[PDB]
């Protein structure tokens, strides 16, 4: 059933402390694609942090307001001095990403991963598509776990930030 | 084809097709050309190489500039260089006028039971061959822009 | 569609499209859609432009009297008051007329009041009613009131003849009043009200100017 | 063909025969056949009285004083036709030359599924952009040739009385605009228009800025 | 192959294969996946250099130091500009960059030779069917095309006072 499925591999094998797809195992492809979703925005976000670490991209940020991308701190703080303009355009793009462009579930309210698609298989037709199973099931393991320690990660990198102000914690 | 300068690379590289449709004379001409253009290059810039930091001969202090060394040699260096080579050519066209004839080969390889391990040596004096081909004409053209050696070139 | 009704609109001249753009096939999606869309754009310019037409001609002498509008003269161009209004004020308008018209735009909702878009076969200008929105809506943009909800046929259809010959009306005139605005004695025997200097088509100026320009 | 050509010779004038006494009619360019040398002569003669065309009309509507009220054009005051090109912004210079360019490249390029003109095609035919949308870059909608469709739909012969039309006009076109800039560069070269257009000192056959006239040769 | 097999023949040129010289009419299969080979890997480095030299010039650059021996910072290299800097690179660094890509290139040619493979070392494939990736292979050939002109263009720009117009 959910003991071998992508994912299912690695030093725990199957890890279910708290017994959620062993109580609901139909909730495991929701759960699957809420893992998918949170795994990518966390890779995002921590190559984020490391890059923005070291290159900033040239130019103003806003010449209204006199705010330029090497004068933004590297962290919340940055995001704090993007202008309200900014933000609102950030949030539409990833409101239409969201929505409409990688539509992680189908309908009703409490939506419901996409019928003729896998747990997050959110891409349309031009996406890198591997035909050869094993590669195929190895790369989505792949995905899966890099998306994990992105998480973990993302988190460690925004607790430090937080108590801080940079994410880097001393030592 | 019968020869052995292809490589990894490029493959058997002729985009222009000069062997396509073309003579085992034709053939023969053109892997004697290439051949000796390379072993002139290999003694080129082994000789500029060498002689920008070790000229011990006619005083120990000729120009190391490859194209000002050769008109401060004297006249009879010339001539005797131009003589040896010429003792050498005469016997490259015999060799080519011989009944027996691979292009390159003064050794007469055709008479010993050769193999790949042979087929891929030739191989190296070819690619080396032309290695070198690039580099003598870039170590000239360096020495006539700058005026320095290609060691010195590289100081 | 396009002969019969300019026909009906007025007989005597029939069809003048002198630069043909009904036949010109935009954007490539086809003559059908060239002509819903222009019928779609005719219908709501004349909307706009009739409602401009009059509020225009209010604001010249009428304000509300609660703030902020309280504060703004009716002797200036009508114009210039939007330029004075909150650069907040002028992003909430737009964006609400932005509602309205991503809602016209949304292809289920008149598919289940049963229209289609106007390009295909959707007939130019049913707006749809608020029902598909998700908390209480009391009222709704056409019939408000419900008022002339059971209206008759051939009226409906004599309705669309008289509304579209009173936009065609009100573009004049809007634009008359915005030419003689911007430029003093651009329209003959309109110069008398209101000369402010500026770009009509610029509706954040007073706020900011896009970088580039 | 050159016997075509002798046909459309009778069209353009009927007193004036096959005028071509150079024989540029028979001859062979580019190892190319003769039928293929005489589309590419059609072509160059109707592009050149096209451009005479639509420059006659040019010259007129900006010696005359008529001129855009924007920017780049309102901030060039000089009324010397040459003048004004040589006061142009390099950038709108190239953005003219290359903008021709670019029509010039669908003017060769045929995707349409008809001959190019020395190839059997019609001499003078600019591929209409809605003939093809997949092979354009985004869509360009109105065509180069006719592009609000005012000719769509007429008979053959009245377009080719309008070809005929075209290359006689363009002919003539091509005297009148060099006559406009000989008389700019050279005055008293042709005698009627003795005062009407302003002596101009530059070169009207360099883009861009030189200082290199025929002065060893003038006058 | 003959060369009309090959993907790039372009709407631009008719969809007709462009050969003004005719290079290419005495070619041979291996030869002329060879040299498809050749344009792509070009296709490739110029796209990459155009990216590079567009960074670099509007000054984008890491925050730190090349190296600490000769104390030059990423701005220092990049201040100087596109060519300059490449020049103020250290000369250590720059063959580290040119050992790591012969690296790649000599595993990529032995597992996926220019010969037998043209152009094609096996990275993963965005789509199957055959019309959409026949018309990705030609997008690639036309920007990568495209992009060896312009990263030539900015270099004589840069170089020669003037040259291109539109040189930003
Ligand atoms: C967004 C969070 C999230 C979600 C939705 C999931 C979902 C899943 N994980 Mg888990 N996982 C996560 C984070 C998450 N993971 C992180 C950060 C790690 C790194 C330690 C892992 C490591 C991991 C492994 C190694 C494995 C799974 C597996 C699974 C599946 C098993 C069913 C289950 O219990 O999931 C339901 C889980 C949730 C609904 C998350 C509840 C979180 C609560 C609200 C807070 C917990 C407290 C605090 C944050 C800690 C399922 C697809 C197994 C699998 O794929 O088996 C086939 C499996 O082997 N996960
Ligand atoms: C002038 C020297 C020369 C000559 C005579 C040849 C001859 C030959 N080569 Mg070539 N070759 C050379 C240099 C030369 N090569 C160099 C320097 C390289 C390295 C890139 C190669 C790489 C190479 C490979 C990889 C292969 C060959 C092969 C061959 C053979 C078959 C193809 C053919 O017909 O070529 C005929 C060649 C000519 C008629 C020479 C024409 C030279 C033109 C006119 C000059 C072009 C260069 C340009 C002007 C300047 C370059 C830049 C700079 C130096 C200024 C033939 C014996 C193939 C072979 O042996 O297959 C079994 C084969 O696989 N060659
Ligand atoms: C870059 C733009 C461009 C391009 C690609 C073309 C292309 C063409 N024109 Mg030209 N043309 C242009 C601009 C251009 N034109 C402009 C601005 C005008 C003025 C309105 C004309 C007016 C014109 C006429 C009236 C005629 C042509 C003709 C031609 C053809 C051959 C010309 C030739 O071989 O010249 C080669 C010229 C040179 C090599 C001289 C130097 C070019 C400079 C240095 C290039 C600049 C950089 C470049 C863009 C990269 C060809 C279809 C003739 C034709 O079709 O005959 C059948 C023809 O009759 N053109
Ligand atoms: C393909 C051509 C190319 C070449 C020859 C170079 C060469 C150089 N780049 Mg690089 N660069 C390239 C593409 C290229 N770049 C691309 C595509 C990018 C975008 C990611 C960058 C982004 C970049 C930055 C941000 C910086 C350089 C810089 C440099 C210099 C130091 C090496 C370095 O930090 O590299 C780093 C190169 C990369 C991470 C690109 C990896 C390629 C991918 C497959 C050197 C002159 C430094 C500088 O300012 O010097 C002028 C510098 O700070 N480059
Ligand atoms: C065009 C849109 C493309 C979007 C997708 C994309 O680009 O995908 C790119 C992609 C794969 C791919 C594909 C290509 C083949 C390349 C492209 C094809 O695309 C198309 C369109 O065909 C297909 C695709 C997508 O499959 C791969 C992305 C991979 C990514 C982004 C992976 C991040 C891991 C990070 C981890 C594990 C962090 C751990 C973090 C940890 C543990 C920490 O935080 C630790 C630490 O910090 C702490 C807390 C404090 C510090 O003091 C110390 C350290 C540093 C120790
Ligand atoms: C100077 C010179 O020489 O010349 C000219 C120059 C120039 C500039 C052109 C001039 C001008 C301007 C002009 C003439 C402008 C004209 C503007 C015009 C024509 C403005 C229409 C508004 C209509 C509205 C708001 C309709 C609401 C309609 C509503 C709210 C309805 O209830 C719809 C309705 O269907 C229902 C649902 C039920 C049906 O039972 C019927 C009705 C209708 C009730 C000049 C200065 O005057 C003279
Ligand atoms: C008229 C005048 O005078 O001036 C004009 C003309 C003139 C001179 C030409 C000029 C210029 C320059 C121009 C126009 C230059 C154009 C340059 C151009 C067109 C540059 C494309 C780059 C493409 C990139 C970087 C792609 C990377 C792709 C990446 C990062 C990938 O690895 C993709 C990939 O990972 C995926 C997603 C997964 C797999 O499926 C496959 C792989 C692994 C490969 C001027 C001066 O500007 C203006
Ligand atoms: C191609 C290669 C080569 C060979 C195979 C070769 C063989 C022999 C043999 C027989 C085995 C003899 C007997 C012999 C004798 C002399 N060689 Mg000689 N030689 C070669 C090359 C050069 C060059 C480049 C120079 C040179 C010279 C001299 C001088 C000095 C004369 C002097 O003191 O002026 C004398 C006596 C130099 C010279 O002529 O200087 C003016 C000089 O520059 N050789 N050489
Ligand atoms: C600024 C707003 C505005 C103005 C100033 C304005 C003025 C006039 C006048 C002129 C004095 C007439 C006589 C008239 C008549 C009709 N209007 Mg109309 N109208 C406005 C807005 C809308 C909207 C949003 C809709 C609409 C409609 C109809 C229908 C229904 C026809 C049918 O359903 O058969 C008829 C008969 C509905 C429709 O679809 O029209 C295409 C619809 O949704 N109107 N309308
Ligand atoms: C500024 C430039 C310019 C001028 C000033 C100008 C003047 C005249 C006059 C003079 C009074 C006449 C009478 C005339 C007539 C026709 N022109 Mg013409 N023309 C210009 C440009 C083009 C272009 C770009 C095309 C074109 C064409 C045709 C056709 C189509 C025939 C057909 O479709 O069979 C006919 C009948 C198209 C074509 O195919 O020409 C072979 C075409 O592409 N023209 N044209
Ligand atoms: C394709 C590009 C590329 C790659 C993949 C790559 C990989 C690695 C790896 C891992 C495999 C290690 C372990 C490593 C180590 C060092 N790199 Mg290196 N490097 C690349 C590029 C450059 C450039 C441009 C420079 C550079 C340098 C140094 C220095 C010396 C610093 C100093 O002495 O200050 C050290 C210790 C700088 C230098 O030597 O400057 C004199 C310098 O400028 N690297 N580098
Ligand atoms: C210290 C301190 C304070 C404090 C504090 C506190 C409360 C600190 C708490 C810190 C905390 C809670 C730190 C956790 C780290 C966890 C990590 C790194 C886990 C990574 C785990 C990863 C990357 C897992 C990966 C895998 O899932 C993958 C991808 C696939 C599987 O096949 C294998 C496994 C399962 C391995 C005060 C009170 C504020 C002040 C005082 O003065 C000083």
């Known amino acids: 059933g959910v003991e071998t499925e992508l994912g299912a591999t690695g030093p725990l094998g199957y890890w279910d402390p708290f017994g959620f797809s062993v109580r609901n195992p139909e909730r495991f492809n929701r759960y699957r694609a809420v893992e998918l979703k949170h795994g990518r925005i966390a890779?995002?976000?921590?190559?984020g942090y490391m890059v923005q670490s070291f290159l900033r991209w040239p130019g103003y940020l806003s010449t209204s307001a006199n705010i330029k991308f090497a004068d933004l701190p590297n962290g919340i703080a940055?995001?704090?001095?993007?202008?309200?303009?900014?933000?609102?355009?950030?949030?539409?793009?990833?409101?239409?990403?969201?929505?409409?462009?990688?539509?992680?579930?189908?309908?009703?309210?409490?939506?419901?991963?996409?019928?003729?698609?896998?747990?997050?298989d959110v891409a349309g037709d031009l996406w890198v598509r591997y035909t050869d199973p094993e590669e195929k099931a190895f790369k989505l393991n792949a995905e899966i776990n890099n998306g994990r320690a992105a998480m973990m990660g993302s988190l460690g990198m925004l607790m430090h930030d937080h108590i801080l102000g940079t994410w880097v914690p001393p030592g | 084809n019968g020869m052995v300068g292809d490589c990894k690379p490029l493959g058997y590289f002729d985009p222009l097709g000069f062997s396509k449709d073309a003579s085992p004379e034709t053939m023969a001409k053109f892997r004697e050309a290439e051949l000796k253009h390379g072993r002139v290059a290999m003694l080129a810039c082994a000789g500029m190489i060498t002689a920008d930091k070790f000229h011990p001969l006619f005083g120990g202090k000729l120009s190391s500039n490859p194209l000002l060394?050769?008109?401060?040699?004297?006249?009879?260096?010339?001539?005797?260089?131009?003589?040896?080579?010429?003792?050498?050519?005469?016997?490259?066209?015999?060799?080519?006028?011989?009944?027996?004839?691979?292009?390159?080969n003064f050794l007469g390889t055709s008479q010993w039971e050769t193999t790949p391990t042979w087929d891929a040596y030739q191989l190296r004096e070819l690619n080396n061959g032309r290695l070198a081909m690039f580099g003598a004409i870039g170590m000239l053209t360096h020495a006539y822009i700058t005026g320095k050696g290609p060691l010195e070139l590289l100081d | 569609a396009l002969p019969e009704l300019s026909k009906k609109l007025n007989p005597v001249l029939g069809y003048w499209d002198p630069l043909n753009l009904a036949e010109l096939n935009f954007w490539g999606a086809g003559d059908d859609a060239t002509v819903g869309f222009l019928r779609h754009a005719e219908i709501k310019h004349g909307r706009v432009a009739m409602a401009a037409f009059v509020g225009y001609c209010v604001q010249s002498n009428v304000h509300f009297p609660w703030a902020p509008f309280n504060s703004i003269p009716t002797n200036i161009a009508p114009a210039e008051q939007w330029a004075q209004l909150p650069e907040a004020a002028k992003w909430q308008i737009i964006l609400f007329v932005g509602f309205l018209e991503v809602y016209s735009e949304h292809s289920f909702i008149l598919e289940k009041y049963g229209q289609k878009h106007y390009m295909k076969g959707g007939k130019p200008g049913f707006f749809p009613d608020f029902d598909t929105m998700v908390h209480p809506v009391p009222l709704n943009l056409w019939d408000p009131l419900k008022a002339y909800k059971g209206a008759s046929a051939e009226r409906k259809?004599?309705?669309?003849?008289?509304?579209?010959?009173?936009?065609?009306?009100?573009?004049?005139?809007?634009?008359?009043?915005?030419?003689?605005?911007?430029?003093?004695?651009?329209?003959?025997?309109?110069?008398?009200?209101?000369?402010?200097?500026?770009?009509?088509?610029?509706?954040?100026?007073?706020?900011?100017?896009?970088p580039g320009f | 063909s050159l016997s075509d050509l002798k046909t459309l010779a009778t069209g353009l004038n009927p007193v004036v025969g096959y005028w071509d006494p150079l024989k540029l009619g028979?001859?062979?360019?580019?190892?190319?056949?003769?039928?293929?040398?005489?589309?590419?002569?059609?072509?160059?003669?109707?592009?050149?009285?096209?451009?005479?065309?639509?420059?006659?009309?040019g010259f007129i509507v900006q010696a005359n004083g008529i001129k855009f009220p924007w920017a780049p054009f309102n901030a060039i005051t000089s009324t010397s036709?040459?003048?004004?090109?040589?006061?142009?912004?390099?950038?709108?210079?190239?953005?003219?030359?290359?903008?021709?360019?670019?029509?010039?490249?669908?003017?060769?390029?045929?995707?349409?599924?008809?001959?190019?003109?020395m190839k059997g095609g019609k001499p003078g035919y600019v591929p209409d952009f809605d003939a093809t949308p997949d092979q354009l870059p985004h869509w360009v909608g109105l065509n180069l040739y006719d592009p609000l469709k005012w000719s769509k739909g007429a008979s053959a012969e009245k377009k080719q009385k309008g070809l005929l039309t075209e290359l006689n006009n363009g002919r003539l076109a091509m005297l009148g605009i060099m006559g406009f800039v000989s008389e700019a560069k050279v005055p008293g070269s042709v005698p009627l228009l003795?005062?009407?257009?302003?002596?101009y000192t530059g070169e009207v056959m360099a883009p861009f800025a030189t200082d290199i006239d025929w002065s060893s040769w003038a006058y | 192959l003959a060369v009309t097999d090959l993907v790039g023949a372009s709407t631009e040129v008719s969809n007709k294969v462009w050969d003004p010289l005719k290079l290419s009419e005495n070619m041979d299969e291996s030869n002329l996946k060879l040299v498809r080979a050749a344009e792509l890997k070009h296709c490739r480095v110029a796209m990459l250099a155009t990216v590079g030299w567009l960074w670099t010039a509007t000054g984008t650059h890491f925050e730190g130091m090349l190296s600490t021996s000769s104390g030059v910072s990423f701005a220092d290299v990049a201040a100087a500009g596109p060519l300059l800097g490449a020049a103020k690179v250290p000369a250590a660094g720059i063959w580290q960059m040119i050992a790591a890509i012969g690296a790649l290139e000599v595993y990529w040619e032995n597992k996926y030779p220019a010969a037998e493979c043209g152009g094609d070392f096996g990275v993963p494939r965005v789509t199957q069917d055959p019309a959409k990736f026949?018309?990705?292979?030609?997008?690639?050939?036309?920007?990568?095309?495209?992009?060896?002109?312009?990263?030539?263009?900015?270099?004589?720009?840069?170089?020669?006072?003037?040259?291109v117009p539109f040189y930003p």
């Open chain 4, 194 to 199: 003795k005062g009407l257009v302003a002596p």
């Open chain 1, 43 to 47: 890779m995002a976000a921590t190559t």
């Open chain 2, 69 to 104: 060394a050769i008109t401060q040699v004297p006249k009879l260096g010339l001539l005797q260089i131009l003589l040896f080579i010429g003792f050498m050519e005469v016997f490259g066209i015999l060799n080519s006028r011989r009944p027996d004839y691979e292009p390159g």
């Open chain 4, 81 to 117: 036709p040459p003048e004004q090109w040589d006061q142009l912004p390099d950038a709108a210079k190239w953005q003219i030359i290359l903008g021709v360019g670019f029509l010039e490249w669908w003017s060769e390029i045929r995707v349409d599924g008809t001959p190019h003109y």
């Open chain 4, 26 to 57: 028979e001859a062979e360019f580019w190892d190319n056949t003769n039928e293929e040398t005489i589309g590419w002569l059609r072509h160059a003669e109707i592009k050149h009285g096209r451009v005479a065309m639509a420059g006659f009309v």
């Open chain 5, 134 to 163: 026949k018309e990705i292979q030609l997008a690639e050939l036309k920007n990568g095309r495209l992009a060896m002109i312009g990263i030539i263009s900015f270099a004589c720009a840069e170089a020669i006072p003037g040259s």
């Open chain 3, 157 to 210: 259809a004599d309705g669309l003849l008289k509304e579209v010959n009173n936009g065609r009306l009100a573009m004049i005139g809007i634009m008359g009043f915005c030419a003689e605005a911007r430029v003093p004695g651009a329209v003959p025997a309109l110069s008398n009200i209101a000369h402010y200097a500026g770009d009509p088509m610029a509706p954040f100026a007073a706020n900011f100017h896009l």
């Open chain 1, 78 to 120: 940055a995001f704090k001095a993007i202008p309200p303009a900014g933000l609102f355009q950030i949030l539409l793009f990833i409101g239409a990403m969201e929505a409409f462009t990688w539509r992680y579930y189908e309908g009703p309210w409490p939506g419901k991963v996409p019928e003729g698609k896998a747990p997050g």
